[PDB]
Structure 1
Amino acid sequence: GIDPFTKTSLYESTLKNQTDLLKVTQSTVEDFRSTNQSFTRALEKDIANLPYQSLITEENIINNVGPILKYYRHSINALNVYLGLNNGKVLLSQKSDAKMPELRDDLDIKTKDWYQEALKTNDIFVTPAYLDTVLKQYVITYSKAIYKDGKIIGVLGVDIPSEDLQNLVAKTPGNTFLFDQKNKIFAATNKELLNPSIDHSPVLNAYKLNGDNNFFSYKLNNEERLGACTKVFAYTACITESADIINK
């Protein structure tokens, strides 16, 4: 309407609404990451709790670590779960025909960020989404250097399809969406937003001007829209709507 009291009431209401919904999308991304981190941490602990004898020959790694990788992979429906060693080999449990985990020598692991970055932090390392060479799907990898008595055993990796996060975000309420660390569109409730030719600059420009969680106005085709974005790890989560709620 027109009376400023009424317009202010509508603006304050929709701000709260849209903020709530943005937070649900933020929570979705957070919970996905923390579930995968907890899992990875539990797997690290089970591997490190084996005696050294079970860890210090490749055959013993196959027979003693392999089943653990397999059970864990199944438990969460991961794509791959694996352990990379300093000799460049990887003990790999992959989705497939029920064949046991095997040692693979062709994964060029000392060139891979999941391997090299795990050795530079004491935390879990989380990759951007990338194309997994084993099963040829886009994954987010959680990796962790495993130590026993201070001694490196190898680098654990857990590959989760990136589509799993995309699908979780898409199911959320609200016209919410998520950009990756390069500010490309990554997930959206409205699948049309994923058209790579769409211009997101008005929303990204408005976020740059306003900051995390700060509700803003912008224009599309000379009509007014409202929205907000916030950082969530290296992602940017946004929500937008028509301003007709406050103007009409």
Structure 2
Amino acid sequence: IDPFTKTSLYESTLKNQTDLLKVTQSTVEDFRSTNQSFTRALEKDIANLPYQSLITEENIINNVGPILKYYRHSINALNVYLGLNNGKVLLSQKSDAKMPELRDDLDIKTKDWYQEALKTNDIFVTPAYLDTVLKQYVITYSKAIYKDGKIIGVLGVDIPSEDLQNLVAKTPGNTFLFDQKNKIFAATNKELLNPSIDHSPVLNAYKLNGDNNFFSYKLNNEERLGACTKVFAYTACITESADIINK
């Protein structure tokens, strides 16, 4: 292959694969920002209630509860809730259409979504974890809600992590996402989810090359091409065979 031609093929495929990597990055970004906007809107609607509606538990149930429910329905969230400093949490949960209940048994001050919300003025986004209420893996968005400077409680919104997984999987390209512990999280090719697959070659090549920088690596003595980039605490990657440049 004339070097001119090989370079043309390499430049083309780098552009192609870069573009697809960016689509997967965008998917992750847009998922987060939609959920943040939602959480912010809910914060605002709660905080705009008069204090009278907020300062007794029965009023929280009757005035906040409907808001949690409507918001939960509007986005098909798994759980939407407001945790109070007395350790109770007003919980709107998926599934029997019973009204939101004020639960005293959920150990909320032990939870990262609660604690961490009180240490930042931003929305806090958890890693994926197993929700204690409905026993599904969720990503939680939490926010300490204040009215005229006084804490009301900590809002939480649980979105199934499978929702993000499914969005990533639908994207074009052989793209995939690792979580903060560098464990595979999502992939267009579901086979990459096998927990016994070794991802060191890709992850090592990423470590050397940095975000969005295309690299070459080997699999079973054949050349492949790829790139990764950080997206929040996740690492998004794309790989392909190098046959496009070599053959």
The two structures have a TM-score, normalised by structure 1, of 0.99
Secondary structure of the corresponding residue to residue 193 of structure 1 = helix
1:17-64 Cα shifts (integer Å, max 9, x gaps): 000000000000000000000000000000000000000000000000
| 2: CA distance, partners of 1:164 / 1:192 | 18
| 2: CA distance, partners of 1:117 / 1:109 | 12
| 2: CA distance, partners of 1:27 / 1:4 | 34
> By how many angstroms is 1:116 displaced?
0.1
In the comparison of the two structures, how many residue pairs are matched? 247
| 1: CA distance, partners of 2:150 / 2:109 | 18
Secondary structure of the corresponding residue to residue 127 of structure 2 = coil
1:212-237 Cα shifts (integer Å, max 9, x gaps): 00000000000000000000000000
| 1: CA distance, partners of 2:239 / 2:102 | 48
> By how many angstroms is 1:192 displaced?
0.0
Identity of aligned residues (%): 100
> By how many angstroms is 1:79 displaced?
0.1
Secondary structure of the corresponding residue to residue 228 of structure 1 = strand
Q: Which moved more, 1:102-111 or 1:152-161?
A: 102-111
| 1: CA distance, partners of 2:158 / 2:106 | 14
| 1: CA distance, partners of 2:35 / 2:68 | 14
| 2: CA distance, partners of 1:111 / 1:62 | 22
What residue ranges of structure 1 are gaps of 5+ in the alignment? none
| 1: CA distance, partners of 2:10 / 2:19 | 14
> By how many angstroms is 1:106 displaced?
1.2
Secondary structure of the corresponding residue to residue 139 of structure 2 = strand
| 1: CA distance, partners of 2:219 / 2:138 | 34
The two structures have a TM-score, normalised by structure 2, of 1.00
| 2: CA distance, partners of 1:75 / 1:93 | 13
| 1: CA distance, partners of 2:111 / 2:62 | 26
Secondary structure of the corresponding residue to residue 13 of structure 1 = helix
1:142 alignment counterpart? 141
The correspondence of residues 200-215 of structure 1 with structure 2, limited to 5 A, is 200-215=199-214
| 2: CA distance, partners of 1:107 / 1:148 | 25
1:134-192 Cα shifts (integer Å, max 9, x gaps): 00000000000000000000000000000000000000000000000000000000000
1:72-117 Cα shifts (integer Å, max 9, x gaps): 0000000000000000000000000000000111111111000000
> By how many angstroms is 1:119 displaced?
0.1
| 2: CA distance, partners of 1:201 / 1:146 | 42
Secondary structure of the corresponding residue to residue 90 of structure 2 = strand
Q: Does structure 1 residue 52 correspond to structure 2 residue 51?
A: yes
Secondary structure of the corresponding residue to residue 86 of structure 1 = coil
Runs (4+) of structure 1 exceeding 6 A deviation are none
1:109-133 Cα shifts (integer Å, max 9, x gaps): 1110000000000000000000000
1:182-203 Cα shifts (integer Å, max 9, x gaps): 0000000000000000000000
| 1: CA distance, partners of 2:32 / 2:104 | 29
Q: Which moved more, 1:103-112 or 1:158-167?
A: 103-112
- Indicate the RMSD between aligned Cα atoms, in angstroms: 0.2
Secondary structure of the corresponding residue to residue 28 of structure 2 = helix
